[PDB]
Structure formats: C-alpha cells, structure tokens
Amino acid sequence: KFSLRMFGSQKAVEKEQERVKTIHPYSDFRFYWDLIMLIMMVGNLVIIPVGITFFTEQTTTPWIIFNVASDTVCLLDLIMNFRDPKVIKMNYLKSWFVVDFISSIPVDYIFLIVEKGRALRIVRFTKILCLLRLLRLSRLIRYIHQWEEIFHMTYDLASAVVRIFNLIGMMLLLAHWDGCLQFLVPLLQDFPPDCWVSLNEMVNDSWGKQYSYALFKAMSHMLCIGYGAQAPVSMSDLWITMLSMIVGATCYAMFVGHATALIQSLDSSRRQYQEKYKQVEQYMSFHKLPADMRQKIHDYYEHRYQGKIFDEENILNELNDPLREEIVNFNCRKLVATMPLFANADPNFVTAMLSKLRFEVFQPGDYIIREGAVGKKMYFIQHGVAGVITKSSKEMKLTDGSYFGEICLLTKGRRTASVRADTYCRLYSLSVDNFNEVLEEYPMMRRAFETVAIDRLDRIGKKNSILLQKFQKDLNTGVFNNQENEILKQIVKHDREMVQA
Template sequence: MTPIGKSLHSNRVAPSKVPHQPTLTRPSDRAFQGKQSDSPEMLVTAAPTESEAKDFESDNEVIDSTGQTLQKFSLLGTPFRKKDSDDGTFAMKPSFIQKRLWTMLEPNANKLSLKLFGSNRGILKEKKRLKAAGLFIIHPCSSFRFYWDLVMVLLLMANLVILPVVISFFRNEGLSTGWVIFNCCSDTFFILDVVFNFRTGITDQKTAEQVILEPKTIAIHYLKTWFLIDTVSAIPFDYVFLLVDDDGDPNLVNISHALGILRLFKLLSLLRLLRLSRLVRFIRQWEQVFTVASAFMKIFKLIFVMLLISHWNGCLQFLVPMLQEFPQHSWVRINGLINAPWFHQYSWALFKAMSHMLCIGYGRFPPQSLTDLWLTMVSMISGATCFALFIGHATNLIQSLDSSSRQYPRRFVTQVEEYMAYRKLPKPMREAVLDYYEHRYNGKMFDEEIIYGEVSEKLREDIANYNCRELVASVPFFSEADSTFVARVVSLLKFELYQPGDIIIKEGTFGDRMFFIQQGIVDIITVDGIIATSLSDGSFFGEICLLTSERRVATVQSETYCSLYSLSVENFQMILNEYPAMRKTMEEIALRRLTNIGRSSSLLRSKILGHGDKAKLMFALPAGSSICLPKEDIQKKEKEVSNSESKESDEVIAVTRNSYATVTCDETAPI
C-alpha cells in the first residue's frame, strides 16, 4: 500500500465481526448520522450491524481508489516520475533543451504544411503522428529542416564558386590553414546531412498521410536515390590520403595538388552538380513558404546557371594549361600571365571562355596548340547549348508572363475578324467592333464570369467592393443604407463599355437600369438637343428607374470611352425582396423625390428664356417651380410660377409671344 493509502487507512480501524467488540469509527459513519455530540466517548460504540459493516467496507474501497489516484500526482499537481521496473530508478523528465529540440523537429505552421494538411488542426494531428513514429524523426515541414536546408544551400553555392578557383589558380595553397578549415567544415556538414536524410520524412502526396514517417521506409528510399552520391561527395578523400602517406615525402605539395584535382573531379562529376536538384527543390519550397513571385525565381535561376557555367568554363581554361606546366604555345604563356596575380589570371580566363561561349571571337589570340583547340571547341559547344537553353527559357518566360496578351489576338481578334467577314460587315463597322474589343479588354484575354464563378463568395464580394464600393456610396439613397444591403447591390453590378457617341439612355424610353461612371465623360442632352451638363468619374445617372416606372426625360450620350457599372431594375427588386425593411425605406425615398422634384425636364439654374428673346415654345410646369426676374428691378421683385394654371395669365401669354424677363428653374429633375 502506498504511503498516502496508509495515511488514509490509519485514521480508521476495520470493523470486527466478533460480537460486542468495541470499534473506533468516524463521526460521519452511518451509526452516528443525526447525532450532534462533541464528547470523545461517543466515538466508541458497540459492534456495528451487518449493514453498517457493508457500508464501512464500501468506504474503504473509495479510500483505496482515491489513494491510487493521488499516488500519481505530487503536491503541486504534476505527475510523479515513474520507477523503472528493473532497477527501481526514476526516469527523468525531458529538459528545456530537449523540449525545444522536439519543437524544432515538429511540422511548423507555414504555407507548405498548410498545403499538405489543410489547417492548423491537421498540423496538430501530424504532430501527434510524428511523436508516435519514433525517436528523432525530422519532419520535412519543420523549422529545423528548413534552416538546415538553407545552410546547406549557402554552403553548396560557396563550394560551387570557391572550389574551382582555389584548385585552378592556387597551386601551392592547397594545405593552407584557412582552406583546410573550410574543407573540414564543409565535409562535416555534408556528412551530417547524410545522417539527417536517414531520419527525415518523405513528402509523398500520393499517400493518405502526405508525409512518410516510417524509419525503415525512409532509409530504403534514401538508399535507392541519393545515398551513394551524397556519401561519396561527403568523404574527404584528399585528407584521408594525406594521413596515410605521412612518410615525409618532399613532393607532398604536388601530391596535395593532385588531390585537389581529384576534388575538382568530385565536384564536377558527383556532388556539386547532382546536388543542384536539391537546390531547385529548396527554392520551390521557398516560393511556397515566402510567396516569392515565380517569374522572379525563374529569372534568378536562369541567370545563376548561366553565370555558374561561365565561371566553371573560365576555371577550366586556366586549369588545363596549368596541369601541363604551361607549354610554350599555351594562351597563358603567350599573354604573360604565368606569374600574374590570380585575379588577373581569372579575369583573362573568364574573358576567353565567354568569348567562345558567345561566339564573338577567340579572345586575344586564336588557339595555338592542340589543347587550346579542344578547349575552344568545348567552350563553343557549351556556349551554344547554353544559348539555346537561354532562348528557350526566355521565350517560355515571356509567354508565361503575359499569357493573356498572347491569347487575345488568337482568340478574340481572329474569331471576330472571321465572323465579320462571314457577315460581310462594312469596313467602318469592323473598325468599330475591333476598337470596342481593344478598349474592353485592353489587349488582354480573360473571362471575368468564369473567374468570378471559380473564386469563393467572399472573394467575389471583396473584388466587387474594391471596384465599385465608392461608386455606390455616391448615391444618396445607397449611402444611408445598411452595409450588407449595399454589399449585395455591389455584387450584382455589371460592367459595360461605351464608345464615343454611343447613346446610353434615350429620352422617352422606360428605364431598366441605372449607371455608375467608373471612367469617362457623358453628356446630359435635353429635349431640344442642348447639352445641359456633363458627368465624369464617380458620378451616376438614371437612378429614378429603380424607384419609379417613369419614362426617361433626357438623353445621355458618351463623350469619351466610358467604363460604366449598371444595376438593373430586376436585380434591384430581387435585393429588395431579400431585405423587406429596405423596400419600405426605398418607397419613402421615391415618394419624397417625386414630391420634391416632380417629373419635369428642367435643370438646376438653367436659363429658359432671355429678356427680349422671341418665344417659340409653350412651357408647362406640372411640378417644380420657376422664377421670373423682371428687367426693371431684378433685386427687388421676384415672381414664382408654381404650376401650369398660373400660365393662363397675361404674363404667361407674354412669355409665349415675346418674353419680357429671364426665366430660370431652381429644381433638379431626374433623368
């Protein structure tokens, strides 16, 4: 029994079944329920009955269960350390460093993990699966693997650039302290990378789990793929050879240089070139995690590969003559570069290599020896290959960057021209149609309805709000409406394009939609053909058709190319059915507008007749008001004509025959 259990049982004595034997019990036992006494003698009673003994045994079972539960916890509520079954020692809790290390091995919440597992809950489930997989399994989406890959890529790029330069242009510095330290650190990291690859999960989207965490499966997969190349590239063969050959040979420097050549062979044939695929994979993961533009990464990779090949070719141009001890007709001896500083040697070698690769010449001199001749041919072949790859990648990149512009002439222009030729349309009409498409799509090809149909409803609302929210807010009866109602209105707006001279609204017709001007200028033309005013970006017109069923009282014509958004009466009524409260509000607004504005075609502060002008028309005012300003005293006398009945007076007859004053209207009527 545990110490806690003993302490609990020590407060009680099991009841004896021998008759008349005194027993010590608690005041809370059933034998003393209902009794209130503080006397110690009350704690000693006669032998309990059979039912009391059963109750006592039941209480003992509860105490045992409680003791076993409390045994698992310390006084602070933390779990006790369990004893080892063999030696009785306690297992230590994981330290802070161990917890941090385990956290680094778990999948991190980045775009790559969210793409694989869908949500934070899926990532949490993957963490639990990782813990059950075994000891020291590195998840490919973990922070540790990300930063380790970043270090390996930087180290790989340093080897790709520095190692050929040292081997080609530094003959006697192969055993310098700095170079030895760099090689040791580099080889150590590559050896550790081999070890970590045996314990890193494999991303496989064909499986249900997306990531394989089985250690045996990981090891078999790595042995079949990159193990041999990584192992051979990580072993420092040159230093192993130096340790074996330690008999003090005076030609140790030459041996070291020969091993440097072996190291270059290892770079070109095994490790460095083949591990470039890992660099590409890491860059793809980098794009997903940091949302780097794909076009930028394509350009970066293309330029990097071209410069790297030029760098290797330049080192090769100097390495081959150096291995031959600079023969008499080598380009190095001809140019007097044998004892020149290494940077001068590298610069001339790079110039010679790029001249061959770009097919612009042979450098300062054509090849004078058979070796230089073969090197020149190798450079030309590599340059032609790189040039072809560059042209292909650049063409593909340009096409991918502006795919909509490429599809526009092929799909729209070609089809439209064939259609117009089939219908035998006249040339001016053909030019107008092509001009419409050019301004409608700006030389791009896309189907906005398909794009809208594929994105989520939230994204559709966000796009519509970004394009049209300010336009809708400019309408008075929309600016005071509920935000959800306005958002619904915005989502049903339709884009329209009009060319200069197009009639958007015809006077006398029934309106079926209102318009918002995103870009362009429109003219409001009265019945007599006068341009009353012009509207531009951010304005609206034709809104009265949404509230009443009146005819249009003016004509609206586009002056320039106009990008408009329209809201149809049908869609507006559908929205009002969804928002009954807004329907009542809109009906009140319509009634107020008809009361204040009426159905006149007059305009704000517009001159109707001037003093002395000969009248040709009879003006009727079924609603609204006009002001007559007499000639003799404009400041003192104003007369308002409120309705058509007042025009039966002599003054009205004078207006219709020979006007005596300037008449203006102080109300704005709907269009």
Template structure:
C-alpha cells in the same frame, strides 16, 4: 327689435323696459311700479301693438330653447360618432402595418424612422493615481525590461523579449510559410558556395596553407546548415495523404525518412572529410555537397509563387545557368593547361595575368563559338576542344531557347493585346469607319491594357474552379454590393452567385453610360473613376457626381410595366471602370431563391413609389398620428374674446352682429344666425358640421 337684442316688455304707463333674462345671467330684475296687465291696459293702441310683439318674441324664445338645446346635442353626437369611427379606422390601419412588419422584418417603410437605442451607462472611470505615481501595470511592464548585470542596470529591447519567448512551430506548411522560404534561401546559398567554389579550389591554386582555415570554416558552416535542414525543418514539413493535411510529428518524420529527399541529404553529408588526414585537404572530397539540388528547385518554386513579377527571376536564373557553365569550362581549361604544362603550346594558358579571368575569356569564346582561337596541337588538346565545341553548342542553344520561352511567357499578354488591336484596326479600315470612332477605339484599347494589364478579366479566371472564383469576387466586390439597399436582407448565397456574374467595362470620357428614356437592363457599380448624372431643361446640368463605390440603375433590374426606363442621362466624367450586372443573369439567379425574389419585388415597388411621389415640404418622419393635437385657436376668435372682455359682460358669451362684425358667440348659437359667412363660421368653429338654418328670428 334689433338683431341680437333680447326680447323685452315695454310699459306705456311707467315707461320702463324690462328685459327677459335667462336664469343663468345672474342679473337682478329692475323693479316695476305696475304689473304687466295694468301696464298693458293703460297703454294706447300703438304701445299695445309693440307690447304684443314683445310678448310674442318672448314666448318664441322661451319655447324654442329646448329645441335649440336638442339640436346642439344632436350635432355634438354626430361629431363624436364620426370621430370615433375615424379612430377605429386609424387603429386598424396601424395594426395592419405592425403585422406586416412582424411577418416580414426586411421590409421597412419610408415613413418610419429608426428609434434611438437606449444610451449605455458610462463605464466607471479608473481612479487617477496621484501625481508622482504610475499605474501598477506600467511599473511591472517597465521593470520587466530591465536587468541587473554586475553593477549596472540594462534595459531590454521589446524585440529581444519577443525573440526570447519565440517558440518554434511544431509543423510547417511548405506552401505558405514564409519562414520556410527564408530558410531555403540560406540552404541554397550554402549549396551555391559548394557548387561554385569547389571547382575553383580544385583547378586554380587559390587554396593555400595560409588561408586553409578560412576555407574550412565556411565549409563546415555550410555543413551545419545542411544538418539543421535535416534535423529541424524537413522533419516538420506537413504533407498531404488521401486528401488530408498531416501535421502529426511522428507521421511527418516517417514521411521524410521514406522520401528520396532524405536519401540525397544523407549522401550530401557523407563524412569524406576524414580522408583529409590521409590525402590532405582535397576539395574534390566535398563534391557530394553539390547533390543537394532538390532544395534549389524547391526554393525556385516557392519564390516564384510569392513574386509578383516572377519572369524577372526566371531571366536571372537562366543567365546564372549560362554563367555557371562558362565557370566550369574555365576551370576545366586551366586544369587541362596545367596538365599539358602552362605555356607549353600556343593552345594552353601561358600563365600570364589573372588566371581565372584569362581562362573565363577563353571559355566564352569556345562555348559561344566565336572563333579566333589557336588550333590544338596534341591529341589531348584536340579531344578536349571537340568536347568543348559539342558541349558549347548544346548548352548555348538550350540557354537561348529557355531564355526565349521566359521572355515569351512574360510578354504573352502584350502580344495578345497587339494582335487584337491590329485586327480591330484592320477591320475598321476595311469598312471605312470614321477616324473619330477609330481614335476612340484605340484609346479604349490602350487605357484598358495599361490600367488592367489585360483586355478581359473573365478570361483570366475561366480555368479556376467556381469556389476560387467566388472567393476572388467576394474580396473584390462584396463590400460594395452588400451596401446596395435593394439587396440588403436577401439570401447571402444569392449575393455570392450574383458576384460571379458581374462584368467589368471601361468607359471613355464623355461616354454615355445610359440615356434618359431607354430601357434599363443593367445595374452599374463604380469601381474606379467618376460618372455624372445630367438633367435640367437642357439636359446638360450636372445634378450629382457619383464616386467609386456608388451604385445606380438597381431599380431597373426588377421594375416592370414601363418602370424600367432610365430617368436621366449618365455620362463618364473621365475614364471610368464599372461593374455591370445584367437583368437576365439576375433572373436566372432568382429562380433558385423565391423568397429573395419576393423581397426584391416589394423593395423595388417601395423605391419606385418613393421616387414618384412629391417630396413633402414639411414634416417629421415617424408614425402617423391617430389622435392629432388640437389646432391653435383662430386669431379672429381670440380677437372676439378680447373684445368681449373689454365690454365687461358677465355669464356666457352672447352674439352681437353689426355689419357682419362678430363679437362673440358659442359655436351652436353662431351656426343658426343668418348673415354670417360660412368661411367665418368654419374659422371659428373648426370642422363641426353645420346643421342648417333654424326657423325663427333674432
């Protein structure tokens, strides 16, 4: 009997063979002319032996069928049991994962991808007006800009509308309000008009009946500015009382009325002009207008507070002091010459040329004590000249000293920079440091000074309170540090404390920021410049270039057990300014924030695992599948099905083996057959375990 054939009975009488078919085959039995017993008796010994073998095979096939069915059932139950246990295990793992996420929402898994938020319904679009029509709102807006005057229509400018609708503030902050600084500028201009022009009009004959109306117009315009300053601005200035900022109208008015400023302002506006009707227009009657000096000093303080280079204004102001003293001296010299008589002596002004220029020239030579002046002749001239010399020496020395202080304060930083650089060069020369190192040190000093204007930023903020230093640090660094994945979800106050510990360091081109294998104790934030990460076999291949705002080395702050070693070389591509956070400073901060410390440790572990595990070639991020989809049908099994279909067989598939060629067979039948390789069986059956060989023969 060939392997794979069904047992059959051979009849020696009629020569017919009858196959033993299963009931489900659905094939009709072939008719037999004789019974099996008669056929067996009518056969010879050889044929009888063949018939007995066939009957034995048929008996084995019939009696082993229940056993084979039970074996297949046991195999299937084992597979189902194992699969159910696997499903229970996967469900438990997923439950633990969800529970961990619910208890600590800040911990995110690398394998999870955020779910897409539901799409918002589109807003209803406004109906499009027909052509030739404009929206109703635009029509009203355009009509508001037009006004009719007589027979014409004019269009208002938008800034005119804003000017018409402007409301004056009920209270003014004198420290921060720029509008108040602008108003003080006009007040100071009016004060300067009085201070500079009153002596000129009193001493020199520049005020005549022909131009008196111009002088009076500007005088009363300055008086109007003084009056508005008293009634409108000074009564609205906020003030501090008991640590509170008072902005009540009545309280602000009472505070101004009780101040020394109000008394001086009243003296400035004394109505001495009524004496014009008695003594004529005498400019000396307007001398009280020069007493509004408080506005001048207040303007200086407010202007210096908003200027970036206040020392320039200080130099100009000091120069103006010197010019004003010369201006007053020239006016006094012309008055003394007129008192003695113009050209009466060689000492007085002779009346030739421009009187103001000639007198100003004499005042410069006198106050600066240049010499070369004619000697005074009369007692009045001698006393006047002595007072001039004493005043000139005192005023000029004060001006020079003040100018030196202004210039010295403006160049104090540069002086400190030069002193540090000279001391460093002297130190390097003493210890015979190589020239290459000295040149790099000099380059660092020069670049740091020219880029920052100082050598150490922390020294500048030492005198400020912690709150102000924190505000400055937040404005400079918070936008960068808040984007670091390691610190997201941490306590906000912890990040604020961390910002105050950042140090600014400048790296020169090709300087190593960190080297591979060294112990990492700092985190770096790039403020300016670029750094390159090197790798490859030779360690010189540029893997990535980090730009301003990038952060690296953050895992080293919390890594332990050898995980805080640098994994690559990082060098500065050009001049780079980096902020550095030291590990020691971070540990001192985390002592006060235990919850943030736990969170940072968990995140550091996850980031280390993600860096160490190999990257998957394929895969879609998402939750792990508990019930994976069915694998595709093996190509060999599909070929077997196609071959079986071409044979035209009916009923369930059977197995025919010819030199290990598999045509078709259910998995339970295939696993029992010898001569079939295990790899082929696994390809056909999948992961179904093999029960082993069954006794019997095919």
C-alpha cells in the same frame, strides 16, 4: 508559412507536428541550415579549382583549414540527410544518400594514410578526389529549387532581372569549371610538348596571370566569340577544346532561350491587348464597315478599358460570396452614399440588389432609351450626366447618383420618355428579372419606387393607370406607417429637387 499553407490550416499543421514529435523536411532548423549548407557547397566548388590549379603545393593553414571546414560541413550534411524512420533511411541510402556520403569524405586524411604506408601521381589523385567531392551539386540544386519555391513566389513583382543574374552566375561557374579543366589537362600530362603553356611561358609567370589566360580562353570558347588559336600542336588538346566548345554552345543556347522566355513573359499584357484589338478590328473589317464606324468603335474600346483587359464576369464569378459582395459594396460607395433611398433602408437589401449590377459605358450623343420601345433593364448613373427629353415638355438633366428606367419595369408597359447621353457616361444596369426577384420580397422598396415613379410621371404629365391603381391599393392597404410615410415623402422631395436641378 509556406509549409503551413502546403500542409493545411493551423490545426492541421499542429496535428502533423504532434504526430511527428510522437527532423522532418518542413522544419525551421533544416529550412535555415540549408542556406548555410548551400553557401558552404558554393565556397567549396569555387575553391576546388583554385586548389587544383595550385596543385596543393602550398596548402598552408588558410587553405588546409578551409578544406577541413568544407569536409566537416559535407560530413554533417550527409549525417543529417541519413536521418518507419529506419526503413526511410535505408531507402534513401540505397537511392542517393550513399553516393552523396561517398562523395562527402575528407580525402586528405586518406591521402596522408596512403603516403604513411609518385608525388605527381599523388597530387593528381588528390585533385581527382577533390573534383569528385563536388557531387553535392544535386543537393545544391534541390536547395535552390526549394528556395525559389519558398521566396521567389513571395513577391514575383519586382520587375528586376533576377533570373538573368541566375543564368549569368551559372555561366560564370561553367566558365570557371571549363578553365580549370583546360588548365589541369596540361598539368595532368605535365605538358611535355610546346602547348600554350610553353608558348606563352605562363608557368614562369604569376599564378594570377596564368589564371587570367586560362579564363580568357574558357570565356572565349564558352561564348560564341572565337579568338581561339588557329589550331593546337598536341593531340588531346583538340578533343578537350571540342568538349569546351560543346558545353559553351549548349550554355549559350540555354542563355538565349531563357532570355527570350523572359522577354516574352515581360510584355504579356501589351501582347494580349494588341491581339484583342487587332482581333476586333479585323472582325470589323471583315464586314467592311465605314471608317467612321472604325473610329467610333476604337474610341469606345479605348474609353471602356483604360488600355486594359480583364474577364470581369469570370473573375467576379470565381471569387466567393463575401469577397465579391464587399468588392461590389466598395466599388459603388458613392452610389449608396448619395442616393437617399439606399441609406434609409436595410443594408441587406442594399447588398442584395448591388450584387446584380453590371458596368456599362455610353458615348456622348448615343440614345440609351427611346420612347415607345420595350424596356428590359434599369439604369443607375454612377458617373456622368444624362438628358431626359420628351415632346412638348422641354428637357431635363440627371447627374451622378441617380437612376432611370423604373416605369417600364414597374408597369410592364413601354418606355415613355427618351434618354440621351451628353458625355461619356458610366452607368450600372440591372436586368428586369433580377430587379423583380430582388424587389418582390422587399415591399418597402417597391412602395418607395412606386411613389417616386408617380412623382416623376406627374412631373412629365402622363398618368399610368396601373401605377395609380397600385398606389391607391397601397394607400387602402394596411402599410401606412408614419415613419415609412415620412421617409417616402422625404425621398420624393429629394428626388423632385434633384430633377429640378
């Protein structure tokens, strides 16, 4: 799983496990018990303020048993954290384990022993010990970080407000702690003067009502909603309210920061697309191009990228050989399945040439190949129609699953015909050097291309002396296999039928 990936492969993980055997943190038992320990810690942290407010006056079996269970869980956690191994345990104890173990203790037994050998003072001491027992927050945060690293990155694509709920729960816990403190401070001093407790007679009211009022001001101060009293009668109340206001301000600022971070991270793709389009349009405006140019460029950009951005060259370069090769194989399955030359050929040659193609998109009406120009690349029509024109020869059309541009790459001359796009056509270009290097060691493909090129040129009417001489030399050569000749004839017939259509 995650531990195996972080360690190495299966062999490395097995070797590490054998070395450990001959208790480590990356163990299934610990990786399952940490959740139970965190749940127990959360329950204890939620119940301790309630017990402090209740002052343990009626700590009956339902509460005493819960406190004992929490203390036992904390003791077990400390014992597990205590455990080459002796030195590590000593270092952990000297660093942080001793403090956590001291914080994890059944203070109820200590209080009972002290009383066996000031009831309000005893209750205050017990409450202070219970509050100090909540020092497991560091371990809880470490476990939460481990869980986030192990599970939050497993999908990370639900598009849900989970982190928002995380800060919501954190703020709720902070507000609960603030209310507990603001209720215990009058209780710690027993509230002699007319503070809020005597102002609203909350002591004579139900415990739920007093908790509601305390939480009410806790939330009001922690939030930026000031429903607070004009002022306080006592002396320490002002200072604890400053403390509450400070922690609430910090919590609200962190809340706003997390919210804006999430908002910025949410709309990232739209942000980069808008940035790129404004960038290109602003560059185009720098040169003061006509508005028609602006519209045409915008149309091209909107039609090539479907409102999307990607460094296709960079991403394809990053990937390894088989993944990239098979991605290319899948992306052009229609091309390889349609054009008969690819099917009746070595698949090694097919993938070797396919690995060098490049995506291109052409607007309708735009000239692709002009007669008389110098040629530098092939063109495979992946999708869309195209037109081939030449004076005194009418015109013809090429559909999907075909190709052009082989004459100049073969004879090293100049472009003969002219090629236009009658629609938004998506083609695959192949550079002259890549084509030559792929085709040089595969003479069968060269012979087939020469034959189909001769057929097409005879269809047009012009005759290339170099291509004719090459064909004559090939015929005079020993490469005259009957099966190869039949395959070439079938390919030529299919190409002629497609060109006629």
